[PDB]
């Protein structure tokens, strides 16, 4: 029924005579019919958070109650698409309006309603069958790589009554009917799922298959699993398309909840041009991905909704059977949005002014990822990975956001105290950086590489060692010197990836292995004692200056141009050079 | 008992966040539980938080989504939360709200207990005498735990405190002096934990066969917060019953109490109270008192309880209210050192800063062995001095070193290599720990062991 | 030039509306007249103060330092109105000036501005006390030249390498300068003295530029190379082999 608006206070709207509405039922407001979601009920009064600037709204304008809460459309065509936080097909709207301005277009179906699709029903279905539903009954053929499928919406189970034949359909044509109860039901190729719910599953399975990235820090000292939970202090984001290119993933989801406008146009521009080419046939990454779009100016409600619709699509493609890698640009923006809404509602804030239930909401954000046995007749598996981001504020190590994230995620990377080298993104703080997948990857690595375990422990030891000494050194022993310059060499060349350059676009495993192995061997061949084994550091420097320059220039071995065999042969030759140089001493 | 029919309300004054306001309520009780029927038929539950006049207030565990103003309904059981209890809950795993997560059924109620409980009579208190073997060399040797001593385990994020807890669960037991282990059980309760490292608790507990004598509780991080508030009290009630009504010693372990503090802050925010220091509620101290000190020995009985919570340090803030208060209410403490974890020592337990208050009486001639106190003192001094000698050699250089300091360095390095290292699946009785300690002590001559009386050296050093 | 004026004597509330007028006019000239414009805002702190007045008058929920919550949204509105668009000429380049209460980088206003704009150029009183006409501390500065100054088609190929090497050497120079105050000059190695000299000559030549001096990009690159020449080639840890052999000799 229609009520009348009663008040406007920024993006809030107090309306009257809306008794009977749930506090997450949607509503249309004003003659322009802006989208809204309820927050607080009181008597017949109600409170409405809108998704659009409220300028020009008059008191008393009609409000139309809609029967459903916030929801997300699903179906074919999702891949290779861009939406906003409320699932807005911006490409369609830009085509339709022929203008760079976004009107108040609140009537645009998220999925195209005209493109036909090649339906190929499963062979095992039978007319009148009492399978009592399930999940799979079809495959859509309209994609070169991502073989989309049609599944059955959950909580709806029953016997076959009619099945469409193979052929073209506009995705609104009913292709399946399950009465089963004396009441007939029809299904299209598109379903609707509430955004804030959790899709159920059969059983939560572990994660042992490893996830390998293009960063030396993570691959080296902070292993991550396929489908695990990680946090990345993104202050880089190229890792997303690096995984799309190299990692064993299928569907890539990125959500720019609060991205700066220029950099968002940047991603939108450069991203579609990348090419993938597994089987020697070039294919754009745009087919194996899907994007969500939100600049910083958009209303707060959209920024809230984007982070959830991202996970809903991730869980849809989890049920789809594939493996998914998702990452969020910045959770801190979502936290700030939650602060803004909470302060707007005039409630009592907690420490630092953040609302108390920040932690609970962040927990809800997680706990929706991992390997899983899905609900369905063809028993199969799927995975979702989540890579959140942390933006260290002025209080790098005391804000509640980093605290709450630190208490949940499994693998965490942080930066140290802010160095003068502001461009030093690959920093690592040992105080709060950790990973809990060390045990699970032992059984994988014992049959691929076993040498890196002592090397990694030595790297951690030496890093700790100068971490301990640099304090006194600011305010000596030969071993102190050897260790200090070794650690500086590691920090400067093994770490300190530019990221953007032909020499750090991606670093496969073997390059890291060679780099660290040679570095640690160089350390070991001098640390043993004054002599070569059980002179001074300066004579070592003057002899091996050229060798040290080679150690530093190891990083300039491009994998895209130089073959792996050439580069490893070069590493071995330089190892022999070190051996000859040390033996002549 | 309640001989009257229950009430059913249809009045819903309004909704505000995780609360629900009702009107026309007849004689509402403060902490009574209620159920809610939704339009789609889904069932829910909540607790009464604030009552005034005919108005009432109810917080909903499952979250207030979809509740309407006419279609929803309410129900009043007319009684505060009560829980069942019985011996047979051993071998069972619950989710904290009483529902068994295991495939098994609902436990039968041998009795019903008030969840809040009531305090101890100070006169009836009894000083602990015996001790509990822990299966960790450091915990048994450097320190000790009486039957009634409450010690926390400070740690930090990224450290393997869950794993120390799991090992303690697998290895817990009483020392056989020469009335069985049937008089020993454990109640492990984990709060606000990740899905991972929780199924790990389940699987590690199930494989070894510990289910015979463990009652387990799991509360997930994504669960309702009020469940987190309730759960540790529930587990303490169960331990209380099993240890006092039935003659049995018990060892309760609690994990990640910082999450409990967070939930306490949540409920405080719900009730509109002004935060005190650092945002934590001002009445945190009283609450933490109520949770603790439900353990010890009492007159006329034989059962006992021993309490071992786990705390997480917010970035090594030793003056943070949580660790500080827990220290003010507990006896002694144990640290976990990050540098040892970097050094790849499976038990990262540190030695120098730790301390047990009641060690002097937890051991003795009537216990495992007479020597132990002297051994502990001597090796404590040796370890401290050896750390100082490593600091010397850092600057002076080995060339200016004496033989005694070389032996001290040997003691330090072998201690680190052998004694402190334990292994995830290795067991050591207290006698073996004493023997290994004597092996370490043997490196020095008899005279260099100043701290130990000549008698003990005469018996044992040869 | 189209210009606006809000002076100190004027009523405070006008500052809320003042900048948006200028931005609307600039938007019109850029997206409609296809003119490349440059909008210079100044003293955004006064805008923040006016917003504080408005919020405090309404008894709205306050936040950090009494600032209202929603100026993050408000500053987002006032800031991103820039960048080119498809099918059109002209552009909007926006250089606002923010005064900095005391010396607080963690103050709310500059911090929030940091989260929105894609860069920042820092001014330090130290250089001003050392009589440097452009007192610009390059260490905290940062911009998204990240793929704009490539060199392929743009000015020159070495741009990023020289910039990075100067940056790192400057950082180490500041480090050794700090170490100098701890221990006397005698304890420094030859490389430490080289770093100190490089630092000194760097602010004396590169940073210190006179007013009205219109240096070209090639000129500054050459000056940078001349500064590089102070060290031998083996300390060029960041420059690739090709450029190093191309220009260093």
């Amino acid at each position: 029924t229609f009520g009348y608006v009663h008040g406007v206070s920024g993006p809030v709207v107090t309306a009257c005579d809306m008794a009977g509405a749930a506090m997450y039922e949607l509503v249309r407001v004003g003659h322009s019919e802006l989208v809204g979601e309820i927050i607080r009920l009181e008597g017949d009064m109600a409170t409405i958070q809108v998704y659009e600037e409220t300028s020009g709204v008059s008191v008393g304008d009609p409000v139309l109650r809609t029967g459903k809460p916030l929801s997300v459309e699903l179906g074919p065509g999702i891949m290779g698409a861009i939406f906003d936080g409320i699932q807005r097909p911006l490409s369609d709207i830009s085509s339709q309006t022929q203008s760079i301005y976004i009107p108040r277009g609140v009537n645009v179906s998220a999925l195209s309603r005209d493109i036909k699709w090649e339906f190929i029903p499963s062979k095992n279905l039978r007319v009148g069958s009492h399978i009592t539903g399930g999940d799979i009954y079809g495959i859509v053929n309209e994609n070169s790589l991502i073989k989309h499928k049609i599944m059955l919406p959950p909580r709806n189970r029953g016997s076959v009554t009619y099945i469409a034949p193979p052929g073209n359909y506009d995705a609104s044509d009913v292709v399946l009917e399950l009465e089963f109860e004396g009441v007939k039901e029809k299904f299209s190729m598109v379903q609707v799922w509430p955004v804030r719910q959790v899709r159920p599953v059969t059983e939560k399975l572990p994660a042992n298959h490893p996830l390998l990235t293009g960063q030396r820090v993570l691959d080296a000292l902070f292993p991550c699993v396929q489908g695990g939970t990680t946090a990345i202090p993104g202050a880089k984001t190229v890792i997303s398309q690096s995984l799309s290119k190299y990692s064993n993933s299928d569907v890539i989801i990125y959500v720019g909840c609060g991205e700066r406008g220029n950099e968002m146009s940047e991603v939108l521009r450069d991203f579609p041009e990348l090419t993938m080419e597994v089987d020697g046939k070039v294919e754009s990454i745009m087919k194996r991905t899907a994007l969500v779009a939100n600049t910083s100016n958009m209303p707060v409600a959209a920024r809230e909704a984007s982070i959830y619709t991202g996970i809903t699509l991730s869980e849809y493609f989890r049920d789809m059977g594939y493996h998914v890698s998702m990452m969020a640009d910045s959770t801190s923006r979502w936290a700030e949005a939650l602060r803004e809404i909470s302060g707007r509602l005039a409630e009592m804030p907690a420490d630092s002014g953040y609302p108390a239930y920040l932690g609970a909401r962040l927990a809800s954000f997680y706990e929706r990822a991992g390997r899983v046995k899905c609900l369905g007749n063809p028993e199969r598996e799927g995975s979702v990975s989540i890579v959140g981001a942390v933006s260290p504020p002025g209080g790098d190590f005391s804000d509640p956001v980093t605290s709450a994230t630190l208490g949940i995620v499994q693998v965490f990377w942080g930066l140290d105290k802010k160095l003068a080298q502001r461009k030093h993104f690959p920093s690592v703080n040992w105080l709060i950086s950790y990973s809990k997948y060390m045990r699970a990857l032992d059984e994988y690595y014992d049959k691929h590489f076993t040498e890196f375990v002592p090397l990694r422990t030595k790297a951690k030891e030496i890093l700790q060692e100068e971490e301990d000494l640099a304090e006194i050194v600011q305010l000596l022993a030969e071993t102190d010197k050897i260790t200090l310059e070794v650690a500086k060499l590691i920090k400067d060349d093994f770490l300190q990836q530019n990221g953007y350059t032909p020499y750090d676009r991606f670093c496969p495993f073997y390059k890291t292995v060679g780099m660290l192995s040679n570095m640690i061997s160089f350390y070991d061949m001098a640390r043993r004692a004054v002599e070569t084994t059980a002179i001074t550091w300066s004579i070592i420097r003057e002899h091996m200056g050229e060798i040290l320059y080679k150690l530093s220039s190891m990083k300039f071995k491009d994998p895209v141009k130089d073959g792996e065999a050439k580069i490893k042969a070069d590493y071995a030759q330089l190892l022999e050079d070190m051996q000859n140089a040390f033996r002549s001493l | 008992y309640l001989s009257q029919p229950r009430l059913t309300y249809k009045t819903v004054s309004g909704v505000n966040g995780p609360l629900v306001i009702l009107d026309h309520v007849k004689f509402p009780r403060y902490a009574e539980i209620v159920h809610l029927t939704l339009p789609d038929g889904t069932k829910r539950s909540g607790q009464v938080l604030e009552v005034s006049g005919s108005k009432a207030v109810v917080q909903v565990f499952e979250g207030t989504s979809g509740i309407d103003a006419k279609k929803t309904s309410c129900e009043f059981t007319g009684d505060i939360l009560r829980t069942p209890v019985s011996e047979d809950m051993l071998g069972r795993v619950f989710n904290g709200s009483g529902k068994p997560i295991d495939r098994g059924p609902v436990v039968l109620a041998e009795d019903f207990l008030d969840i809040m409980g009531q305090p101890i009579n100070p006169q009836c208190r009894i000083y602990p005498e015996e001790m509990i073997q822990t299966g960790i060399s450091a915990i048994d040797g450097m320190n000790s735990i009486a039957r009634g001593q409450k010690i926390p385990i400070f740690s930090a994020a990224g450290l393997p405190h869950n794993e120390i807890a799991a090992q303690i669960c697998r290895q817990a037991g009483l020392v056989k002096k020469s009335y069985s282990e049937e008089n020993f059980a454990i109640v492990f309760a984990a709060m606000g934990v990740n899905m991972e490292t929780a199924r790990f608790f389940k699987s590690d507990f199930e494989e070894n066969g510990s289910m015979d004598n463990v009652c387990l509780f799991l509360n997930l991080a994504n669960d309702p917060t009020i469940e987190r508030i309730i759960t540790p009290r529930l587990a303490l009630t169960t331990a209380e019953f099993l240890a006092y009504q039935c003659e049995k010693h018990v060892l309760v372990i609690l994990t990640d109490m910082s999450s409990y503090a967070e939930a306490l802050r949540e409920v405080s925010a719900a009730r509109e109270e002004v935060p005190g220091r650092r945002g934590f509620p001002g009445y945190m101290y009283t609450d933490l008192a109520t949770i603790y000190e439900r353990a010890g020995r009492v007159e006329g009985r034989n059962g006992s309880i021993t309490q071992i919570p786990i705390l997480t340090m917010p970035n090594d803030d030793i003056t943070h209210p949580i660790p500080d208060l827990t220290g003010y209410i507990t006896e002694g403490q144990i640290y976990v050192d990050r540098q040892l974890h970097n050094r790849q020592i499976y038990p990262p337990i540190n030695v120098l800063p730790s301390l047990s208050r009641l060690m002097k009486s937890a051991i003795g001639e009537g216990m495992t062995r007479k020597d132990h106190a002297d051994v502990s003192n001597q090796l404590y001094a040796c370890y401290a001095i050896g750390k100082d000698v490593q600091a010397m050699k850092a600057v002076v250089g080995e060339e200016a070193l004496t033989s005694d300091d070389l032996l001290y360095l040997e003691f330090l390095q072998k201690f680190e290599k052998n004694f402190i290292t334990q292994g995830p699946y290795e067991n050591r009785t207290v006698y073996e720990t004493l023997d290994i300690g004597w092996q370490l002590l043997r490196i020095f001559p008899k005279e260099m062991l100043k701290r130990i009386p000549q008698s003990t050296l005469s018996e044992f050093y040869p | 030039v189209c210009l606006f004026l809000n002076l100190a004597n004027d009523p405070t509330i006008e500052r809320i509306i003042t900048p948006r007028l200028a931005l609307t006019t600039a938007e019109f000239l850029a997206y409609q007249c296809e003119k490349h414009v440059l909008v210079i805002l100044t003293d955004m702190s006064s805008y923040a103060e006016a917003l504080r007045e408005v919020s405090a008058a309404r008894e709205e929920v306050p936040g950090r330092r009494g600032f209202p919550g929603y100026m993050y949204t408000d500053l987002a509105t006032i800031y991103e109105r820039a960048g080119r668009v498809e099918g059109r000429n002209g552009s909007i380049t926006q250089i606002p000036i923010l005064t900095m209460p005391n010396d607080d980088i963690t103050h709310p206003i500059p911090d929030l501005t940091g989260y929105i704009t894609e860069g920042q150029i820092y001014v330090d009183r130290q250089l001003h006390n050392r009589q440097i006409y452009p007192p610009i501390n390059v260490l905290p500065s940062l911009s998204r030249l990240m793929k704009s100054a490539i060199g392929e088609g743009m000015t020159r190929k070495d741009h990023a390498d020289v910039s990075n090497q100067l940056y790192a050497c400057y950082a180490i120079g500041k480090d050794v300068q700090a170490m100098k105050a701890v221990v006397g000059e005698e304890a420094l190695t030859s490389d430490d003295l080289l770093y100190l000299e490089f630092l000194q000559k760097f602010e004396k030549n590169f940073i210190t530029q006179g007013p009205y001096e219109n240096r070209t990009v090639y000129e500054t690159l050459d000056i940078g190379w001349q500064l590089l020449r102070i060290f031998p080639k083996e300390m060029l840890k960041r420059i690739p082999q090709s450029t190093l052999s191309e220009f260093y000799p």
């Binding site: 005039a346 009592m348 804030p349 | 002004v274 935060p275 | 008894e59 929920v61 306050p62 009494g66």
Partner: peptide, 13 residues
């Protein structure tokens, strides 16, 4: 703390 207490007290009206 003072500011929050002030707004809380004002909330009564």
């Amino acid at each position: 703390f003072y500011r929050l207490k002030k707004i809380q007290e004002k909330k009564k009206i």
